[PDB]
């Protein structure tokens, strides 16, 4: 049940690169599964924190605790302002 994310990964990669830069058939796919692994590797770390408190729900505060512990410090900055705005 390790489902893949959408082809919308293609377009996120295209906007990430300069205009003079183009992308391969399977480099599209390598990212598609590297980001599929990214969702499971984060959900598992945050699930353990949820269980530490016998909490039956996973929120945005747990995913951001997970990415802070797992080592994505470049991500938690902008993601906090994004999550608080989603509730603003």
């Amino acid at each position: 049940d390790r489902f893949l994310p959408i082809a919308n990964v293609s377009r996120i990669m295209k906007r990430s690169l300069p205009a003079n830069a183009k992308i391969s058939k399977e480099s599209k796919e390598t990212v598609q599964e590297c980001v599929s692994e990214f969702i499971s590797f984060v959900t598992g770390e945050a699930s353990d924190k949820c269980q530490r408190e016998k909490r039956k729900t996973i929120n945005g505060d747990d995913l951001l605790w997970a990415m802070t512990t797992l080592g994505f410090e470049a991500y938690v900055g902008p993601l906090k302002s994004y999550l608080n705005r989603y509730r603003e």
């Binding site: 994310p5 399977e26 390598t30 990212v31 990214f38 969702i39 984060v42 269980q51």
Partner: protein
């Protein structure tokens, strides 16, 4: 693509319910994750004076990034 980010989130063991905000903050986190992986891959591709982002470049980005130590199962180094 909110539904799949939930589907994969609960497919792999998750604790029961998922709050609506978790997949929304995840897609954005997945957006920033593709960026850094694609930034790091193309930096390797452009350093080799290639204008094509190929499967080899993502292997180099995962390899020497200690942040992506968990991804080596997909790329044969």
């Amino acid at each position: 693509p909110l539904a799949r980010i939930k589907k994969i989130m609960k497919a792999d063991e998750d604790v029961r319910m998922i709050a609506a905000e978790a997949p929304v903050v995840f897609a954005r986190a997945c957006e920033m994750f593709i960026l850094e992986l694609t930034h790091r891959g193309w930096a390797h591709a452009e350093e080799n004076k290639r204008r094509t982002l190929q499967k080899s470049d993502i292997a180099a980005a995962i390899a020497r990034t200690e942040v992506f130590d968990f991804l080596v199962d997909i790329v044969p180094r």
